[PDB]
Amino acid sequence: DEFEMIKRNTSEIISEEELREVLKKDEKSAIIGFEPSGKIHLGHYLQIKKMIDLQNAGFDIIILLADLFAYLNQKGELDEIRKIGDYNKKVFEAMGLKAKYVYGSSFMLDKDYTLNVYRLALKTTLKRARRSMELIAREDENPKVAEVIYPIMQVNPLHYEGVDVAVGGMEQRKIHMLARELLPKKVVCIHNPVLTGLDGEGKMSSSKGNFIAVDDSPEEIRAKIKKAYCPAGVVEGNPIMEIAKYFLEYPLTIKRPEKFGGDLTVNSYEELESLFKNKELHPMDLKNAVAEELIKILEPIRKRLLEH
Numbered sequence: 001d002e003f004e005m006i007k008r009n010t011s012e013i014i015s016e017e018e019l020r021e022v023l024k025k026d027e028k029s030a031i032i033g034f035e036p037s038g039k040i041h042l043g044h045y046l047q048i049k050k051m052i053d054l055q056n057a058g059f060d061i062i063i064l065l066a067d068l069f070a071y072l073n074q075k076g077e078l079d080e081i082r083k084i085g086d087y088n089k090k091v092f093e094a095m096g097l098k099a100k101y102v103y104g105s106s107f108m109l110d111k112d113y114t115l116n117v118y119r120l121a122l123k124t125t126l127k128r129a130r131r132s133m134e135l136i137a138r139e140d141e142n143p144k145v146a147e148v149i150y151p152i153m154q155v156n157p158l159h160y161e162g163v164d165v166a167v168g169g170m171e172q173r174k175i176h177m178l179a180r181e182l183l184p185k186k187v188v189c190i191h192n193p194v195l196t197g198l199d200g201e202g203k204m205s206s207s208k209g210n211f212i213a214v215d216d217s218p219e220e221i222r223a224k225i226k227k228a229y230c231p232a233g234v235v236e237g238n239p240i241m242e243i244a245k246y247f248l249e250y251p252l253t254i255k256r257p258e259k260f261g262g263d264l265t266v267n268s269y270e271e272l273e274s275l276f277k278n279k280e281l282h283p284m285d286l287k288n289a290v291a292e293e294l295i296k297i298l299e300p301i302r303k304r305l306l307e308h
């Protein structure tokens with residue numbers, strides 16, 4: 001099913017009935033926005049993989065390099081942000097994405113864009129804007145006015161003209177709930193889960209420095225994975241298991257020494273999860289398998305980012 005391919009590994013689709021209608025049409029487009037990021041990590045790639053799914057299913061793909069948004073979220077000066085955006089777009093092309101790339105600031109300063117922001121600032125409460133940003137806003141002991149403008153710009157109808165589907169992480173869902181209420185035409189949201197960071201502390205993050213970057217060296221992936229929170233028998237909160245779920249190909253053959261049980265062949269992640277949960281498979285053989293298949297999945301991307 002095209003539908004079930006798109007739905008595989010998302011946390012929610014709002015809504016499924018509207019997505020079946022979109023899939024019927026001959027012309028459909030899907031958008032995702034990203035604040036430019038100094039490092040692109042597996043959190044980014046999970047979402048790019050969803051966009052490749054939509055692209056296989058017939059959708060035109062639009063990537064918004066959300067530079068002004070990064071600007072409001074205190075990531076720096078704009079033309080410095082627009083140069084990080086340029087690099088991120090190289091990375092997304094090396095992931096195998098066939099898309100159109102738009103810089104926010106190329107249209108977000110237009111008079112009609114600006115008037116919608118003022119119009120929406122009239123319908124949106126300070127309390128709701130702030131709630132909507134709890135998972136997104138840069139850490140700040142004295143919150144700035146910029147924090148409450150960010151979500152109203154994210155739900156501006158100009159971002160969604162001729163767009164059927166928006167894709168984002170679950171950390172964006174309150175902002176999308178706002179847009180569901182306030183947008184003139186309905187857009188389907190597809191939310192992808194948030195990856196746990198390597199120490200299990202919170203969520204994977206370019207500023208928490210708890211991530212694996214797609215351009216990481218092999219030795220580097222090994223060392224991050226070796227150090228990673230992965231309690232025996234525990235799946236919930238375990239970032240090594242998450243990587244197994246969202247990134248690996250099954251059936252999976254796990255090489256191990258014959259004293260640890262010999263080569264193991266798992267035909268599904270659900271099979272891996274039962275093996276792991278009852279301790280027929282130890283963190284260390286998991287880790288070696290995950291590290292080794294992660295290296296092979298990332299290699300072509302590291303290669304073209306390094307080509308020259």
Ligand SMILES: N[C@@H](Cc1ccc(CC(F)(F)F)cc1)C(=O)O
Nearest residue numbers: 031032033034035064066154159
């Ligand atoms: N909040 C996102 C960035 C963002 C996501 C979505 C949009 C609207 C749209 F998706 F681009 F159309 C604008 C910016 C993030 O946290 O990177």
